[PDB]
Design an enzyme around this catalytic site. Structure first.
Site, PDB file in Angstrom:
ATOM      1  N   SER C 349      -5.077   6.586  -0.993  1.00  0.00           N
ATOM      2  CA  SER C 349      -5.908   5.538  -1.583  1.00  0.00           C
ATOM      3  C   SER C 349      -5.219   4.953  -2.815  1.00  0.00           C
ATOM      4  O   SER C 349      -4.966   5.663  -3.788  1.00  0.00           O
ATOM      5  CB  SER C 349      -7.280   6.100  -1.960  1.00  0.00           C
ATOM      6  N   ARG C 350      -4.914   3.659  -2.778  1.00  0.00           N
ATOM      7  CA  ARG C 350      -4.143   3.038  -3.853  1.00  0.00           C
ATOM      8  C   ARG C 350      -4.938   2.909  -5.148  1.00  0.00           C
ATOM      9  O   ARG C 350      -4.364   2.908  -6.240  1.00  0.00           O
ATOM     10  CB  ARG C 350      -3.628   1.663  -3.425  1.00  0.00           C
ATOM     11  N   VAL C 351      -6.257   2.798  -5.011  1.00  0.00           N
ATOM     12  CA  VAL C 351      -7.162   2.704  -6.153  1.00  0.00           C
ATOM     13  C   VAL C 351      -7.378   4.064  -6.799  1.00  0.00           C
ATOM     14  O   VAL C 351      -7.387   4.194  -8.024  1.00  0.00           O
ATOM     15  CB  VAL C 351      -8.536   2.172  -5.717  1.00  0.00           C
TER      16      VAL C 351
END
Ligand SMILES: Nc1ncnc2c1ncn2[C@@H]1O[C@H](COP(=O)(O)OP(=O)(O)OP(=O)(O)O)[C@@H](O)[C@H]1O
Ligand SMILES: Nc1ncnc2c1ncn2[C@@H]1O[C@H](COP(=O)(O)OP(=O)(O)OP(=O)(O)O)[C@@H](O)[C@H]1O
Ligand SMILES: [Mg+2]
Ligand SMILES: [Mg+2]
Lengths: 485, 473, 485
Positions: C349-351
């Site tokens: 998950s990039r966030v």
């Protein structure tokens, strides 16, 4: 509105143009548009004609005027091209004023017949030891330079040019060997810096440069090799010797498959058209040795092919190998281990080497190629750590010494006379006793020993070029005595 | 006066066909306009179907068009404003501002399609371009007017490494920078712009140093495949006009090839190997060649690279690498050890790492550093199993030597001043080479390892060693 | 008329080409004599290609067709909640006519660069392995990629059910309306999927856009966009909406069908070049509006079905490139027992923490570490006890940490119940407990807190953080239960 020498553009796109008219045009004839862009009638149909664009289609508008040249695409050929950098058309791109051409030759020439030819027999010193020992090149041979990205493909062709300076500055002509480098699909800087190195070594005086940058339209890159070829063919017919190097033909086919696919042609293997073979075929054939009646001239070619992941089984590569007279594969692995040039004796080959190799090297280097071939088989088979017998171990010790001896730095060309001695020691085994880390210093120290002492031997191998039964003995006693100390 | 009009005859996806008057058809690669309720639609010429009919590619949505509508001809290829007024401004592929900061009051407007500089204008020698990072100038140096490959996605502070090069060069060479986003994620584009205002690379009230030109992913292939050219144009301006060492950032060169592939796909052109377009080879050059060092100025390209299915045999990557001169890799395992930037010394390589380029001294110095780290990587096994005592006097020495060199690579980012709070430093190539040269000889073996972590200069290294030791007393 | 009407020239393959309508718009709807409607995607100079929403048995040759002067539009608003509509937006559940607050075009432009905010509002899925490892954020685009029958729907489905914790509350900026988009699924499946949400009281805030496989291709094409608008409504008005595309794979197939039948250029795997423009123009519609825009938000959970783990395929590569993270699922992990089988190694998950509760972030920062080292030393678990104690310790944790993530279906847990389980796992208070009793451990432990330490749980639910006081109070309560166990 003369529908006999001029016509109107019906449509344009994909780098092709369909003009209406030109009833008296020849197949594959050069043409020009109102914008000044040069084209070529690649095909003729009833009621329309197909023209390839050598420039951006932006300049070609629909409904313009189209005049014909009346002559097939040709390029200026002569001695005045020496030291001058031109493009695919033959126009100067360096800015040293127009080219002094003696004549104009078709861009598409047919290879010399079978009768007006002779087997190659003229050695072509490349300066590289591992090369002019395993797979030597002769005047009229077609030696391929296959290898992966950054493996030293041009490094072998480039050093060859700089080594020719030893004869280009001489009085005799049959000894001089003109050079014609061909750059296609390369960068601007890459070629510019390449030229600069030639000027530093003062090798540009006897070299011609033909440009076909990637920025330039595909067709330019397509016609660049053919035209550049005609530039060197001139020297051949005049009884002179020329040397042309394609760098690289693999990109060309890619540029050609473009026009090939745009013109809607059934895709083949790897999306290359079925006539991709006739491409490189027609180009290489124009490099051979003419008979004495023709002028005893020749044209040596050095095509270059870039493979992926050390795959010589690819399509483009194999097609070239089935034309060239031997290959010099450059494995990446050996290139990283320091072993440079990374010549893989396993895949390297010379179909006409011994025939065009110095007898001084043929004697000292006997069965050296096959030995190395079998070397990697037993070497890579004993790298597991297992213990072997004396037979395999003995061959394993001598193989390593030869492998390190083949190594050579760039920009360091050695005379044949200097190479002969090194090979002799390797086969005999005098090096075997020598430590592995002293093989490098030994070479530089051994050469000085001959010059300072047995200089007479060097002068004999130079002129004669063959080792008599007497000089063979004087040499042995001279090396053996040095190995002991 | 000179008003050119035509009528839409065909609408198929992002491909629209207009009919103009006889012998009045606009050339190719031009810019056509159509009235739309939102603003306007842009159509780039592509082919002349014939019969006074041309086929163009849409640079925006095509839903709504109706056969017959008028179509204006600008007469010239797409134009983008050039000048110091673009700095600190978000510009789209069309050349219009979308940052809602009003119209970009520029004096001139250059086209996106330009011919690559001539052979004679090219340089005859490659020179190194001082960036400001030891990990760079010493290991994988940037070629002036060359192409650099940046690997590694988010998590390695990619963005942080970009704004850095923009600051450094702005202070050392004083050359501006141009960021170009092809198929940039609208999400990331937002956070980028905002971050850039927080670092100081972009000031609204003051003076910006870098121009932004994003090309959203929700845009049609036509626009995607031109975003790069848009940003290139603006950069060439400061090369030929002001003659500066401008840096052009492209993220990511991969979507640029993908863009072309979708465009050439719709046009009907037959698919090459692997599915890519046949014209791929030429397109790549119509962008890379334009980025070079001229007699006036220079443009250094810093573009990211994506490896399709971790395969380098693929055409797109294969073709891209053919122009790359250096590669700055960013590994997770590097930032994991607390090493910033996350630049990997082993993977980072350059085509200007030779004595005939950086000098014999620089060469040997850089080579030894790599040699020291290389042998250390292989010892990372016997050390974590049988302890460190399992090394000779010569091995254990280099090991303790590498520990200092690897940490010494780190460097405080001047742009991340508000992020960390620690003053950043700008190391020059002159001091860098002299720094490691003195460590290798073994003149700082009595100096603690922590004294080389996040150190700006060698002189500062000792300045920190004295403080740490004084605090111990 | 010829301008507002047209005659069917040819019909077939669910696509009929009509002649006329010289004023028809692009992608505009039209109505045939029979009653079936269609939309023209191709606008040719001679004829107009129009897809059908119904059987092509109704359409004949020469039949008359008239315009609608309207682009694909669907009614949006809070009236849809608790209903089940098709791609167009008509009722199929039989609950009467719908009450919409307006309409929105199927094709809407995504929010610009400026009108957005960095995601910061967590989307509690109720999945321990998710909210702990791969946190999802309001406005993020998290992709649920995985082979057939892996647990892709389970992830989303549980997420929706886990929303009864806030939707039945009073505050709006806390709720989350769910919009499920059934594409290519048989009716039987939808009727069941709906019947599950009801038995859990979830239809109260869920919108079903059914697009069964028997329905015409275009329906399956417009479904995702239709539903897209519906949710944007919530986003624009300043709220929160979760939309799950299950699945985009089927959508592409539908679209491919139309494109091929219309004779548009075929690309990789028979997908037209605009296939990527399709999904990119869909996912980019979901985001996080800024404070000025309304602070509204639209989350997207697109589902992609791979063929034997092949994430390298065309479609998947497109989607994975656009989204902002994946929840990769493997059948193998499923068989072992690990359910849901969420491959921690790939799932990313990039966030990340940006959208995760600090109450869980304080105990999850380390949980990614242990698991990371566990996958590396997983081969050792197969060998004898000859393993050193250092590595052995990792195995002790991993076995148990992996056993905790195993969560039964239809059984979401609030953060107040996750933290206690993660905290006891990370520190290692389960290492002494048998790896067979880990399941019942969760049961008896939760019930304990909710009777003796209820005050602690409620403080974590409200504050959302863990103060030094709680960290000590939680530890003491744990060690007490582990002791008495
Ligand atoms: N014998 C050698 N010893 C040391 N270095 C070498 C040797 N030969 C080549 N190199 C180095 O390899 C680098 C790569 O250049 P080179 O042209 O040899 O690669 P290439 O495979 O020919 O590339 P391309 O095919 O793209 O032109 C050169 O810059 C040169 O310094
Ligand atoms: N968390 C879970 N716990 C227990 N069983 C589960 C869980 N998740 C899924 N299942 C099982 O998975 C099966 C259906 O899996 P699921 O629907 O999640 O996969 P899918 O992504 O929908 O695959 P398909 O593409 O075939 O629909 C059911 O039989 C159910 O028993
Ligand atoms: Mg080469
Ligand atoms: Mg499912």
């Amino acid at each position: 509105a003369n529908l006999n020498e001029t016509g109107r553009v019906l449509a344009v796109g994909d780098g092709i143009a369909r003009v209406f008219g030109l009833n008296n045009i020849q197949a594959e004839e050069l043409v020009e548009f109102s914008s000044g862009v040069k084209g070529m009638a690649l095909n003729l149909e009833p009621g329309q004609v197909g023209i390839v664009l050598f420039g951006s289609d932006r300049l070609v508008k629909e409904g313009e005027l189209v005049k014909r040249t009346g002559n097939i695409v040709d390029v200026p050929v002569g001695p005045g091209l020496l030291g001058r950098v031109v493009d695919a058309l033959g126009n100067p791109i360096d800015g040293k004023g127009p080219i002094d051409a003696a004549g104009r030759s078709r861009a598409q020439v047919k290879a010399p017949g079978i009768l007006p030819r002779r087997s190659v027999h003229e050695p072509v010193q490349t300066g590289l030891k591992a090369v002019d020992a395993l797979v030597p090149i002769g005047r009229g041979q077609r030696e391929l330079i296959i290898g992966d990205r950054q493996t030293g493909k041009t490094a072998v062709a480039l050093d060859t040019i700089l080594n020719q300076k030893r004869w280009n500055n001489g009085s005799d002509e049959s000894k001089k060997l003109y050079c014609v480098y061909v750059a296609v699909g390369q960068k601007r800087s890459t070629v510019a810096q390449l030229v600069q190195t030639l000027e530093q070594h003062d090798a540009m005086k006897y070299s011609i440069i033909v440009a076909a940058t990637a920025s330039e339209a595909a067709p330019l890159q397509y016609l660049a090799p053919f035209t550049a070829a005609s530039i060197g063919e001139w020297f051949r017919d005049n009884g002179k010797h020329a040397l042309i190097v394609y760098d690289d033909l693999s990109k060309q086919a890619v540029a050609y498959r473009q026009l090939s696919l745009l013109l809607r042609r059934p895709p083949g293997r790897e999306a290359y058209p079925g006539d991709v073979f006739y491409l490189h075929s027609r180009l290489l054939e124009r490099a051979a040795k003419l008979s004495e009646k023709e002028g005893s001239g020749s044209l040596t070619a050095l095509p270059v092919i870039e493979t992926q992941g050390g795959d010589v089984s690819a399509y483009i590569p194999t097609n070239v190998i089935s034309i060239t007279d031997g290959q010099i594969f450059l494995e990446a692995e050996l290139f990283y281990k320091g072993i440079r040039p990374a010549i893989n004796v396993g895949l390297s080959v010379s179909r006409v080497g011994s025939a065009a190799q110095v007898k001084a090297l043929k004697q000292v280097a006997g069965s050296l190629k096959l030995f190395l071939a079998q070397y990697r088989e037993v070497a890579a088979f004993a790298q597991f750590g297992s213990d072997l017998d004396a037979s395999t171990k003995q061959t394993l010790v001598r193989g390593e010494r030869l492998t390190q001896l083949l190594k050579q730095n760039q920009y360091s060309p050695l005379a044949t006379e200097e190479q002969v001695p090194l090979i002799y020691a390797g086969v005999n085994g005098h090096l075997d006793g020598i430590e592995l880390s002293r093989i490098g210093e030994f070479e530089s120290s051994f050469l000085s020993y001959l010059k300072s002492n047995h200089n007479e031997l060097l002068t004999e191998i130079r002129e004669k070029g063959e080792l008599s039964k007497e000089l063979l003995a004087s040499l042995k006693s001279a090396t053996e005595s040095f190995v002991a100390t | 006066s000179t008003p050119i009009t035509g009528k839409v005859t065909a609408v198929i996806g992002a491909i629209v066909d207009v009919h103009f008057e006889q012998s009045e058809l606009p050339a190719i690669l031009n810019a056509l306009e159509i009235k739309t309720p939102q603003g306007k639609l842009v159509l780039e010429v592509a082919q002349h179907l014939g019969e006074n009919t041309v086929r163009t590619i849409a640079m925006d949505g095509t839903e709504g068009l109706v056969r017959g509508e008028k179509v204006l001809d600008t007469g010239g290829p797409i134009s983008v404003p050039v000048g110091r007024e673009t700095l600190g401004r978000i510009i789209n592929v069309i050349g219009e501002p979308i940052d809602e900061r009003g119209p970009i009051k520029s004096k001139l407007r250059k086209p996106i399609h330009a011919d690559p500089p001539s052979f004679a204008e090219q340089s005859t020698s490659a020179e190194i371009l001082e960036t400001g990072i030891k990990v760079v100038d010493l290991l994988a140096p940037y070629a002036r007017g060359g192409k650099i490959g940046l690997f590694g996605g988010a998590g390695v502070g990619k963005t942080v490494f970009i704004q850095e090069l923009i600051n450094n060069i702005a202070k050392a060479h004083g050359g501006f920078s141009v960021f170009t986003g092809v198929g940039e994620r609208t999400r990331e584009g937002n956070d980028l712009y905002r971050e850039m205002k927080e670092t100081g690379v972009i000031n609204l009230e003051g003076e910006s140093k870098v121009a932004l030109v994003f090309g959203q992913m929700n845009e049609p292939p036509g626009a995607r495949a031109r975003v790069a050219l848009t940003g290139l144009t603006i950069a060439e301006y400061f090369r030929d006009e002001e003659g500066q060492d401008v840096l052009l950032f492209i993220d990511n060169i991969f979507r640029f090839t993908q863009a072309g592939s979708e465009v050439s796909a719709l046009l009907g052109r037959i698919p090459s190997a692997v599915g890519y377009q046949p014209t791929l080879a030429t397109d790549m050059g119509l962008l890379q060649e334009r980025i070079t060092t001229t007699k006036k100025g220079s443009v250094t390209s810093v573009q990211a690279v994506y490896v399709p299915a971790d395969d380098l045999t693929d055409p797109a990557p294969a073709t891209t690498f053919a122009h790359l001169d250096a590669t700055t890799v960013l590994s997770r395992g590097i930032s994991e050890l607390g090493i910033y930037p996350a630049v990997d010394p082993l993977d980072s390589k350059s085509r200007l790492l030779d004595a005939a380029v950086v000098g014999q001294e620089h060469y040997d110095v850089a080579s030894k550093v790599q040699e020291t780290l290389q042998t250390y990587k292989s010892l990372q096994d016997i050390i974590a199993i049988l302890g460190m005592d399992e090394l000779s006097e010569q091995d254990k020495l280099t090991v303790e030597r590498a520990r200092k060199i690897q940490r010494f690579l780190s460097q405080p980012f001047a742009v991340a001043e508000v992020f960390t709070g620690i003053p950043g430093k700008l190391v020059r190539l002159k001091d860098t080479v002299a720094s490691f040269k003195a460590v290798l000889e073994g003149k700082y073996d009595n100096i603690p390892e922590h004294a080389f972590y996040m150190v700006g200069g060698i002189e500062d290294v000792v300045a920190k060693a004295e403080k740490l030791a004084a605090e111990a007393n």
